[PDB]
Structure formats: structure tokens, C-alpha cells
Amino acid sequence: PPLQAVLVADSFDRRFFPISKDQPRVLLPLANVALIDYTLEFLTATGVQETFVFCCWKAAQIKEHLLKSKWCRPTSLNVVRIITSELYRSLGDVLRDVDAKALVRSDFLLVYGDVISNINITRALEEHRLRRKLEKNVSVMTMIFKESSPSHPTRCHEDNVVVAVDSTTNRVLHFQKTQGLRRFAFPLSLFQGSSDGVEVRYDLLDCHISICSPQVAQLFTDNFDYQTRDDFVRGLLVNNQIHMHVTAKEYGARVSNLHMYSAVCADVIRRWVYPLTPEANFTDSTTQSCTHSRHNIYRGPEVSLGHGSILEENVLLGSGTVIGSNCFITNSVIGPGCHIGDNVVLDQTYLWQGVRVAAGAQIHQSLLCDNAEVKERVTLKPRSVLTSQVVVGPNITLPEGSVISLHPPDAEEDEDDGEFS
Amino acid sequence: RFYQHKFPEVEDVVMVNVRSIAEMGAYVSLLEYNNIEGMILLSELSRRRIRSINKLIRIGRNECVVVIRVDKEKGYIDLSKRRVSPEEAIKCEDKFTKSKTVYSILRHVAEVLEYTKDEQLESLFQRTAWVFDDKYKRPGYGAYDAFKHAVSDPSILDSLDLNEDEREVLINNINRRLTPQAVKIRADIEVACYGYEGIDAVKEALRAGLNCSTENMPIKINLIAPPRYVMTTTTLERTEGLSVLSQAMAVIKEKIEEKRGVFNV
Amino acid sequence: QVPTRKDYGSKVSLFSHLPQYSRQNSLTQFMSIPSSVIHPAMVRLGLQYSQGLVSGSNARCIALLRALQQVIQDYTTPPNEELSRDLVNKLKPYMSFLTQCRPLSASMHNAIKFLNKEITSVGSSKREEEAKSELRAAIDRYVQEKIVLAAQAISRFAYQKISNGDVILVYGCSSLVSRILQEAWTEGRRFRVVVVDSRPWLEGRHTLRSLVHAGVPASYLLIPAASYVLPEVSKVLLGAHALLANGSVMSRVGTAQLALVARAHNVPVLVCCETYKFCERVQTDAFVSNELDDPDDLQCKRGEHVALANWQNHASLRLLNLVYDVTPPELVDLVITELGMIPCSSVPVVLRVKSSD
Amino acid sequence: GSELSERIESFVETLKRGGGPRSSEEMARETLGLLRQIITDHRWSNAGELMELIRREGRRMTAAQPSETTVGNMVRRVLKIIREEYGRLHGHYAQLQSNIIEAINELLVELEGTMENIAAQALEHIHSNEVIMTIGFSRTVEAFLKEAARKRKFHVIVAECAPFCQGHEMAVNLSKAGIETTVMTDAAIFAVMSRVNKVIIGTKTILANGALRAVTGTHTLALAAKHHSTPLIVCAPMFKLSPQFPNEEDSFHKFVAPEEVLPFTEGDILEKVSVHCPVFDYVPPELITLFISNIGGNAPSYIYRLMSELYHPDDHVL
């Protein structure tokens, strides 16, 4: 039985703004390389020869970016199935396409293009396959999804999951989410059936990983009233039971909001995902080959350090970069071409292509984008976002929230740049 | 045993296992006649300055030794590597192996009154190996001694018939260990077509099933995979492979394109 | 060929990879006493080893050398077995015999390897007698050049080294350390040599007697009080049997702790081993390949009330004594050999430039 | 006939998933098997362009995976011997590739004779009714201990490195031969080091200063052994030597995912404490004692003569 997978781009229960305008929601460079390459080398990390990535959004961009990888050509163990922008909305018409075009035999991986992880998936794949062979296809799927605490930066309350499940034969009972509930109640009718007992488990975070054999193509196209996977599996859990496996060590999580962007970009360089750690140069980008050093710093080539710039935890630079003096940079990533001048203080900056920072500028908890001539004393605070060529000047400061850009209605800015409020 | 002209010729090839190593040398036990024990030699385990003793030889493995010139009491029993510069080696390994099979079928001649202790082994070997120098080529002797036990292929099988013909060998032994080797292969298909030239072509897909049933002999198409089926190939010949490939690609190259359908490898 | 020697008394719990002997019963209590099962010089050298008659530094090498030359230069050459290759395998009972007798100094191993390499160098194509005489010429030029020319070459070089008033010590039993002492003394020099020795050999005797008969002022203290030469030693000559490929050296029980107590002052230890003694076996600890002589030779003379006569009456008491020892390569610094004065850790690079390259 | 590129890339790509295979010297087996093929249809005219082809493909094979030099010393090995054979040709064309593959056959018999040599050099150390120690896991020191298990009666202890317990497995393995070993935790590397007698270690790579590079816990084992000065015998075959130095960049060590040492069952703690672990330490050259090697023994700083011979140092930098 050969092993393929489908790879959706983006469920449009939308949380990314306004970063999903010029570049998409999925070409999101976490450490100076596109996030499609991270999730695609997760899919190449475990053994899958052929996978289906679906595109909806500006086929010219993802077309051009998938013209200069090295699995453009099938010399390696992948070539990539890509298609162009007819009628596509979300995962709904994705699975309706995957059982209308019918590119499925059995047991493929359903992941978004938005998970980065290190599960070598094949273990519970074969345990699930044993459960299929032995017991008459009553068990639909198996989901593997982490063991953790009730307190973690990745278990923020958007994808908080409690499940109730037995531990002998690990079939789930309730996939009850917790986006705002605080009293819990479980319908007691399904405990007299298993009188030896049943656990409850909150030690969970969903990896958005799970396998699927095309019984769910039948239970998905027949039942139109499920579109997202969560009300889907709850409808599975009210009427076919679906199983469970608790992995112990390796993890991944779906980078949904920018909260997960912060947690993952501070975890790949705290390095909980090795083999994935960006010194490997997954692309053929000689403009990415970076050199690891003590306490997790990563100097780029022709780095041009500023004198006295002290580095403590988890930083980078790029290629062609000129960094200035007196930088107390910690837990950040920097992008290429940056003419970041003298005495620029940073802390967890996620700076991207083409920037030229002016001198004497604190920047704090930020993430900004291409061709941004940022200027004097732009002091920020947690959860602040500049985006895509908009220019601030002599201390146009910003508070906690910053939905700003260069486009007029989404931003806090008109046609021109942010020089004057 | 394996050729009773014991002391072999001048600049030939043989192999050997090394049962025990000496103080200075490494005195190896040659096996192309029963239980002698030879030596090694000094200079050429290479052609330049290697000069070491135990990183080339196990107490236990084989290698492809080469003889220079052996006599009796000049004491030059040559076990080394001289001049295998473009030269093939592993012909002698297959000679070794086929002679070991010749032994293995004839070590057990061993008829049913268990007399393992000493039946005179040459009484069942010697007369059954004696006339088989029919041509002079020793690789030709290799293919002719391989030709010796594929017992129906020399169906001129006369000249000391031992018996009626080969009695104790041909009751199960000649027949008993054919030892054919084959690897399963399963070349697939995926043809279909749609239209009213596609109704003609779905008639022609069903007769394509008929056609790779009866014309070029692909045998026993079963119906186990409900979208699309299989056609079988097993080496007793190995030349079914290029025929099946030529006809399946003739199908994709002239059959399907005239009837406007979908098919690939 | 040969039987083995029985054990006597008991043994320590540790050394049961090592056999112990006695000289009250030896090898030739039983065996083929006209020696033709084995060559006569072998049982000669064996039973004079069993009473320790040749217990020297390279004296043992030359004793086995005269024994094996009396083997080879009367050797019947049998047919039906080859010109040069019935020797070395029949010489396997020879050194296994002497290993049974009392085990080998590594000098004798180097002799084995050289006459091995040379009897391979003459094979089949020559008649056995003038090949035997060319083997005589090769072994004679070998022992002459290496042993004797190494002794006078290091005499000229250590004569350039050692100067006036250098009070130098020996743990003395060899034919090289007292050699360098006398043929440095008799050229207009001055140095007050002191010998040190040890229970139960009580051997400093050949060295101190040869010094006094050569006219050198001598002093004397035994290693159980070796902390009294602790300040005043100016340099020390250490007579080592073998010299391994760590950089280590190799000699008796009583070069064990004087080496460390004279590393504990920066007094530069000076070992004397020529080109012949560079071995290839490399040990690290002190019980691995080390012999054990007759364990009831350590008794006391306190009138007649000796403690160690009937020591098998009571249950669990034992005896033992080691004989050889190895010092680490930290302590030992300078070796005395031919091409120069090579240091410790750079030894086997000399051993590859006289090994057929 | 150009189906060669795909397996160069499959080999560096399985060098990017940790590195295959599992065990130690089978890495050397698959890499020299995939190194004897580097002149199959890889054709040329003169030796200089062949040299530069080995230059470019060898350096991308070494920079694709820089945490393993067992492929790098072998590509330096092959470039050295081919320029050696051309230099012996001159004092251009014909007889080269034959003698090349013949030399490769020589060294590929060598690299599989290694563990037999180190197994058969293993009774010249060990006594009766004493104890002995080793840390980590290597099947070379396993061959040493099983040989000495076959001939003597002694009493091993093993202290294990436990970010990942790679030392419980030999700790159960060594009671199969009937040794009766006792296993402490690595808290007691000094509580029992009075009542040790000797300790062996299995290295991974030894640099061109004679300085080895081993698993976690070996640096503290050497410099906690010389508070008793019991010797360290290092197990070190002649293929996993490196002509490298500690200085070229970092990633001299190898940083792995540190969920080996922390669980996800803690509460609210792991947001800030920035954990790190290498799997590999670095040990001074001047503290280990001697080789058990596939020429025999060597002193731990003799190694420059071997690296004068094996690697032509002008193309050690390659």
C-alpha cells in the first residue's frame, strides 16, 4: 500500500491580517525560508513520495516560487501536485475534489500547509492499519495529538481540546472544545456501556495531522452539513467510532494566529524539532547557508557585525546584511539585505526582506516586512505589527494592538506612509 | 575432489578459506582437493608499500587468490594477488559455488542404510565425473559442468550409465534439486476511455482485457482490485518481460490514441 | 612437545592468569633427558633459567642467541619438508618451551622477530649449508652492529652529555648502565654514583662491584628507604629491560616507585635502552603481562623463629611477589639510544625508520 | 548511463535525517560502497579535471552534512590515493582507474577486518576478580568486553549517559555472557571511582591533534578518572579517524531536540528556561593513555605520522 498525502493551503476561518494580501498566508518566512518548505520537508521527513498541495490565491506568485525549488524536478523523492484557483474556498471543496477527481486509494495524511513538526508518522499509521484489518472497518480514523500540560504557549485558548476516551482500547467519546466554556459536563449515557471505567484527558494539543482512508470521503460528501473537521468529528461522535494515540516526545502545532508564529519561531531555535533547524539549508539557497554557534545564534554569510553587538539567545542575520553597533538582541530573527544601522535596539523582532532601519531605534516584539525604511525612535510593545513598505518616522509610537499596513481600510494609514497622524 | 588433477596449473585462479593463521605466514586450507593446507606469500598482496599481516585475512573468510608457479619440493605454493589489473575475479567464485553444489548433491548419495562413516566416496564420484573433459575450455568446463546436472539438457546421457541410467541420482536427486530462482513482478495497467468513440473504446477496453488475455500470453488476470487489475510475469524465461513491455507500449502508442482514451505506465 | 611445571603452594585471588613455579621441582624431572625431542641447547637454557643463572638485561638475549646458534649451525635438513620453513615452525616448541620455563623478556621477542625475518629472507633456491652460513653471517653482523655499535655510540653521545660532578644514581643490574658509567669515568671525569637495590634478589652487586673495580665511589640504599636519597640526587640512570610504544619503559619491581619519587623533584630521569629494545606490545597496567617468581623466597632470618616456613598449616594466609613493572610515560623523559637523544613519546617513529623503509 | 546523481542526493538527504544507518561502521560500509562508484561513467581526459570533480562533489557531500567526517576523511582518502597513483605513473591516461578500484578493494577488506582485529587484541589487558567500567555505547568496546568475557571472570560496572539511556542496553547485554555487572546511575561516577580498577571508552572521531570527540559524559569521565589516575583505553578503528581540528567553525558538537531531558508533564514552567544539549563532548588529547587500534597501540599524540601518510595535507583542506 503506497503512501500519499493531500496538503491544503488555508482554511478560511480567517485569523491572518493583513499579512495575507501580497504574500499569501502560507509563504510566511519563519526563518528566511518559506513555510511551505517547512511543512513540505515534514512531508519528506516521513516517507511520502507524492503529495497534493492545493492553491487558490494568486497562481503567479506560488507558481514562480515553485519554479525555483529543487523538487521542481522529480530527481528527489517528491514532485509536487499543484493546481490553479478555480472555485476553491476551503477544505470542504478540497475533500469534494479529492473524491470527485478521486486521487485516493487508502490511508493518506491530512495536514494543512501550516504544520511544522517532527513526528515520524508511520507508527500509528500501522497501528491504525492493524485496527482496520482486524475489526471490520468500524474504526474510522486515528488521530495522534500531543501530551502536554494545561499550561503552554501553544495551548492558547483557540485550539484548546479536551477529549474523553478509554485507555485500553483508546476510542474517543467527546471532542468537546473550550473556546470560552468553564463548566464541563459529559452526557452520562455512555458510561454504563463501559463499566470498568473511562478516563478523561486534558493533556492534549491537536497537531492537525491526522490520517484518512477514504471512508471519510463517503462520510464527508454524503453529509454536507460538515465542512470543517471539528464539527465533522463531533458528528462522528454522536451517531463508526474514531480512535486515538498519545505520542510521547515529538511535537508540532498549527501556526494559526501570530501567537503561534511567535511560539514556533521561538521553538525552532530553541530547537525542539531537530532534524528541522535552519542551518540545514533545505533550499538550494546559498543566500541562506548560516553557521551555528554557541548559545543558539546563527550568523549569516558576509554578516558584517556591528562592534559591541552582544548576542545571547536565539538570533539570526541574513545575506548582504549590515547590522550596526550596540544591539541587545534576544529571541529574534532577522532577514536578508537589511541595512539596519547603528544603535538599533531589538528584542524578538521578526524582520523580513529589504529593510533599512535608521539609527537610534528601539524595536520590540515586532514583525515587519519588505522595503520598510523604518526611522527614529519607533518604540513598540507586545503584539505589534508593521507590514509591507509603510514607512514610520520620528517616533510615531504604537500601543499594544497594531492592525497597520499600506492599504487604506485595514491599516491605520491612508495612501502615503505613516509619517504623520 | 572437485577436479582430481589436484595440483593446479601455472597462473590460474582459485579461492580458499583460511582456517588458521601461522606465526609468520597464514597457512590456508585449499578446498579444490580435499584436505591439504597451503600458505600465503610475501610480496604482492598489492603492488605497492602496504606491508601488513592481519587486516586482509580473517580466521574464517574467503578471497580470490592467484597462483604463480607451484612445484613439489621447491616448496612454492603460491597464495597471493599478482596481476588482476583488468581481470575478472568472481568467475572462479561461481566455479567454486557450482562445484560446491556438485558436492552437495553428491555428499548425500548416502543411501537408506545410514553408512555415513566411510562409504568410499570416489566409488560414487569418480565414475560419475570421469568422461567430462569433453572439451578443453575450463570456463567451457564451467558451463559444461553446470550442463552436467540439468539432467534433461544432456539427453544423450550415456557413457557409464552406472545402473539402468543414473538410478539413485535420478529417482529424486537430479529431479529433487533443480533450484530455480525467480522474483515476482506485477506490471500494472490503468486504461479507460469515455465518449461514444468511448463506448467503442470501452468495448475496446474490455477487449483489451481479452487481448492481454489471449494474444501475447499474459496469464491469469484476476479481479481483486476493483478499479483496475493486474497482469502477471514470472521468470521461467525472463523474455516475457520485453514482449509484455513492447505490447503494452504498442497499446499506448497506437491503440489508445486512435480511440481517444487515458492510459500510462 | 613438552610438559608443563606444576604449581606450588597457593596464589593470590588476582593473578590467576599467571602461573607460579618453584625451583625445588623443575622441568627436567621427567622429560627426554638426552635432548632430542627438543634441541639440547633449549633444555640447557631452560634449566639454567630455572635457577636464574642468566638473569641479565641483554645477557638473556645473548644466552638464547648462543643456544639458537647451536640449534641452527648443526641443523639436519630433512627432505619432504621445505628448506626454510621447517625451521620456524619447529621453533614454535622452542619459545613455547622457554615460555613454560620462565617467561620471556621482550628482548628475546625482538631476537625471535629478527631471525624469523631473516630465515624468510633465504628461501628454497640455495643449498642448506651455505645458506646456514649466510644466516650465521647475518645474525652475527646483526648482534655485533646493534648491540655493540649501539653501546659505543651511546657511549660517545652520553660522554658528550654527562659533565663533571653529576651525582647520578642507578637501580643497578645491567650491562649498559654500569657500561656507560665506566666508559664515561675513565676519560677524565668525576661523579659519585650511588646504587639502589631491593629485596629478594638483593641485586646491585654486579653494578657496584664493577664500579668499585673500575674505581668509582659508591653509596648504597635499598628502595624500602628510598625517601632518603630524596633531596640530594642530581640525575638518575634507569636501567630498563624493554621500552614499549607508549613512550613507557619496562624493568623490575625496584624501578617502580623511584621513578615517581624522582619525578616529584624535577630530577630528570634518564633511561638507557638501545635500538634493539623498541618493542611493539603495549601494556598499561601492572598486572597484565608480568611474571611471578618462586613465592617462598622472601623468608626471614630471626635466629630460627621464622614466620614463613609452615605457612600452609593455617587457613587463608598467602604469599606473592611481582618481578617486572611498567612506568607511565609522563615520568620518563629521555631515552639513551643511537641516532640522537630522542624523548619519551616520540619513540616508535624511530622504530618505523629501521623497519624496512 | 548517468544514473548516479540520484543516490548522491539520496545519500546526503539521509544524511539530513539524522544520519542513516543505525550503527557505527555500517555507515562506513555504505559510504565506501557509494564512494567506489564515483568514477563509473564519471569520465574525463586528464587527472586534473578528475581531481576537480572529486573536489566539487566531495565538498558538497561534506558540507551537506558537516557533523560527520566519516565521509570526509574517505573522500580525502580517495583523492589522495588517486593523485598518488598518477604521481607514480609520471615518475597521463591509461592504467589509472583499474589500480584505483584495486586499492579501494584493499581498503574495503581492511574496514571490515577492523572489529575482528580489535576483538582479537583484547586479552592483553584484563585480570581476575577485579572490576571495570565503560561509558556510553559502541560495539567496538562491546567486542572488547565480550572477548574478555569469553576468557576471564571479572565484574563490570557501566555508568550510562542519560539524556537518552544508550547504556541500559549493553547493561542488560553483558549479563547474557554471565558477567554479573552492576549498574549505578551517572550520579556515582565518583562515589565508586575509589573501587574501580580500570575504565575503557569507545570514541567516535579523533582529530589531527590526537584529540578525540566522544559521547556525552566522556569529558567528565577522563577528568574524573585522573582524580584516581586509572588509565583510559580508547577503542578507535582506523577509519573513524579525522584529520580535523576544533577550530573550523562551531557545530563541532551536535545539538538535538531537548525533549530527551524535559517532559511535557510539568505545569507552567517551560516557557522561559532555554534548554540545550549536545550529544557529543570534547576531551583533551593529553589525558587518555593508548590506542587499541588497527595497527596496534599508539600514544595519544603520535597520530601525526599516520596523518602524514594517509592524507596528503595540501588537499586535506580540499
UniProtKB/Swiss-Prot annotation, chain A:
- Looking at the keywords, is Protein biosynthesis present? yes
| Keywords, ordered alphabetically | Acetylation, Cytoplasm, Disease variant, Initiation factor, Isopeptide bond, Leukodystrophy, Methylation, Phosphoprotein, Protein biosynthesis, Ubl conjugation
**GO BP of this protein:** astrocyte development; astrocyte differentiation; cytoplasmic translational initiation; hippocampus development; myelination; oligodendrocyte development; ovarian follicle development; positive regulation of apoptotic process
Tell me the residues on which Phosphothreonine occurs. Answer: 277
Record PTM text? Phosphorylated on serine and threonine residues by GSK3B; phosphorylation inhibits its function. Polyubiquitinated, probably by NEDD4.
User: Source organism's superkingdom?
Assistant: Eukaryota
Location comes to: Cytoplasm, Cytosol
Gene Ontology MF terms in the entry: guanyl-nucleotide exchange factor activity; translation initiation factor activity; translation initiation factor binding
Summarize the activity regulation: Activated by the chemical integrated stress response (ISR) inhibitor ISRIB which stimulates guanine nucleotide exchange factor activity for both phosphorylated and unphosphorylated eIF2.
Phosphoprotein among the record's keywords?
yes
- List compositional bias (Acidic residues) regions by residue number: 411-421
- Please list the residues that carry the modification Phosphoserine: 90, 405, 421
Q: To which protein family does this belong?
A: Belongs to the eIF-2B gamma/epsilon subunits family.
Name of protein: Translation initiation factor eIF2B subunit epsilon
Q: What is the scientific name of the source organism? A: Homo sapiens
From Swiss-Prot, chain B:
Q: Where, if anywhere, are coiled coils annotated? A: none
Give the induction note: Up-regulated upon endoplasmic reticulum stress.
Q: Which organism is it from?
A: Homo sapiens
Summary of subunit composition and partner proteins: Eukaryotic translation initiation factor 2 eIF2 is a heterotrimeric complex composed of an alpha (EIF2S1), a beta (EIF2S2) and a gamma (EIF2S3) chain. eIF2 is member of the 43S pre-initiation complex (43S PIC). eIF2 forms a complex with at least CELF1/CUGBP1, CALR, CALR3, EIF2S1, EIF2S2, HSP90B1 and HSPA5. Interaction with METAP2 protects EIF2S1 from inhibitory phosphorylation. Interacts with ABCF1 isoform 2. Associates with ribosomes. Interacts with DDX3X in an RNA-independent manner. Interacts with CDC123. (Microbial infection) Interacts with rotavirus A non-structural protein 2; this interaction probably plays a role in the sequestration of IF2A in viral factories. Interacts with rotavirus A non-structural protein 5; this interaction probably plays a role in its sequestration in viral factories.
Give the family, as the similarity comment puts it: Belongs to the eIF-2-alpha family.
The keyword S-adenosyl-L-methionine is assigned to this record: no
Q: Does the keyword Lipid metabolism apply?
A: no
**Keywords in UniProt for this one?**
Acetylation, Cytoplasm, Initiation factor, Mitochondrion, Phosphoprotein, Protein biosynthesis, RNA-binding, Translation regulation
Task: Show where the S1 motif domain sits.
Answer: 11-82
Subcellular location(s) per record: Cytoplasm, Stress granule; Cytoplasm, Cytosol; Mitochondrion
Q: Name one GO biological process term.
A: response to kainic acid
Q: What is this protein called?
A: Eukaryotic translation initiation factor 2 subunit 1
Q: What Gene Ontology molecular-function terms does this entry list?
A: ribosome binding; RNA binding; translation initiation factor activity
UniProtKB/Swiss-Prot annotation, chain C:
User: Which Gene Ontology BP annotations are present?
Assistant: cytoplasmic translational initiation; myelination; oligodendrocyte development; ovarian follicle development; regulation of translation; response to glucose; response to heat; response to peptide hormone
Q: What outcome follows a substitution of residue 324 to H? A: In VWM4; with ovarian failure
Instruction: For the region May bind the chemical integrated stress response (ISR) inhibitor ISRIB, give the residue spans.
Output: 5-14
Keywords per UniProt: Acetylation, Cytoplasm, Disease variant, Initiation factor, Leukodystrophy, Phosphoprotein, Protein biosynthesis
Explain what switches its activity on or off, per the activity regulation comment. Answer: Activated by the chemical integrated stress response (ISR) inhibitor ISRIB which stimulates guanine nucleotide exchange factor activity for both phosphorylated and unphosphorylated eIF2.
Recorded GO molecular functions are:
guanyl-nucleotide exchange factor activity; translation initiation factor activity; translation initiation factor binding
| One GO location term (cellular component) | cytosol
Q: Which disorder does the record name?
A: Leukoencephalopathy with vanishing white matter 4: An autosomal recessive brain disease characterized by neurological features including progressive cerebellar ataxia, spasticity, and cognitive deficits. Brain imaging shows abnormal white matter that vanishes over time and is replaced by cerebrospinal fluid. Disease severity ranges from fatal infantile forms to adult forms without neurological deterioration. The disease is progressive with, in most individuals, additional episodes of rapid deterioration following febrile infections or minor head trauma.
Species in which this protein is naturally found: Homo sapiens
Q: Which gene encodes it?
A: EIF2B4
Curated annotation (Swiss-Prot), chain D:
The reply to whether DNA repair figures as a keyword in the UniProt entry is no
Example GO biological process: response to heat
**GO CC aspect terms:** cytoplasm; cytosol; eukaryotic translation initiation factor 2B complex
InterPro entries annotated for this entry? Answer: eIF2B_beta_subunit (IPR051855), IF-2B-related (IPR000649), IF_2B-like_C (IPR042529), NagB/RpiA_transferase-like (IPR037171)
Compartments where found: Cytoplasm, Cytosol
Cross-referenced Pfam families: IF-2B
Gene Ontology molecular function terms on file: ATP binding; GTP binding; guanyl-nucleotide exchange factor activity; translation initiation factor activity
Question: What keywords tag this UniProt record?
Answer: Cytoplasm, Disease variant, Initiation factor, Leukodystrophy, Protein biosynthesis
Q: Which domain of life is it from?
A: Eukaryota
Q: How is its activity regulated?
A: Activated by the chemical integrated stress response (ISR) inhibitor ISRIB which stimulates guanine nucleotide exchange factor activity for both phosphorylated and unphosphorylated eIF2.
Q: Which Gene3D superfamilies match?
A: Translation initiation factor eif-2b, domain 2
What do we know about how this protein assembles, alone or with others?
Component of the translation initiation factor 2B (eIF2B) complex which is a heterodecamer of two sets of five different subunits: alpha, beta, gamma, delta and epsilon. Subunits alpha, beta and delta comprise a regulatory subcomplex and subunits epsilon and gamma comprise a catalytic subcomplex. Within the complex, the hexameric regulatory complex resides at the center, with the two heterodimeric catalytic subcomplexes bound on opposite sides.
Q: Which family does it belong to?
A: Belongs to the eIF-2B alpha/beta/delta subunits family.
User: Which PANTHER family did the record assign?
Assistant: TRANSLATION INITIATION FACTOR EIF-2B SUBUNIT BETA
Gene name?
EIF2B2
